[PDB]
Amino acid sequence: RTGSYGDVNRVDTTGASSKSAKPEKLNYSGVAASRKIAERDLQSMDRYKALIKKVGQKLSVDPAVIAGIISRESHAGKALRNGWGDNGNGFGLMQVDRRSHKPVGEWNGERHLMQGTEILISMIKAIQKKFPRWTKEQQLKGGISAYNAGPGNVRSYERMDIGTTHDDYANDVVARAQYYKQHGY
């Protein structure tokens, strides 16, 4: 499923920076690093695969992108403490910020995934409004970056991820997504 927000396969990526790769005990960075990390989360992700696809169907969002976010946010849950991460602010597989949203649902359930994905949509639409001369695919990458840092942070295409966690968030997520898209998402 491509979704209504652009084709993730058409988005360029430089993958995970050293800052993301090191914590995962990898001695290389880049797209292969993103792919490896995603692969490591594949079995756990696959626990949720039919829900992710329901959610992608309902919202016209690529389930691969949802997966890529989950991997990055929570390692498909493996990084959480009883549902929580981000210094106690983030909830669930997609790590919805409780400070600005009212988290709904079980940490690993459909309502949660719907919530996170609606929020993603809202970021993408923000970027579409902010940068109407970008392509849909450009806007998609920006949206994903904004999922981490807010649309305010996106002031460029090529350097959007400056100011995201590890200064690589959308690049990493896009690579993860492109991986999952090849693994049944």
From Swiss-Prot:
UniProt keyword annotations, A-Z: Antimicrobial, Bacteriolytic enzyme, Disulfide bond, Glycosidase, Hydrolase, Secreted, Signal
Record's subcellular location: Secreted
Presence of the UniProt keyword tRNA-binding in the record: no
Principal place of residence: secreted
Keyword Nucleus: no
Active site per database record: 73, 86
Main function: Has bacteriolytic activity against M.luteus.
Protein name, as recorded: Lysozyme g
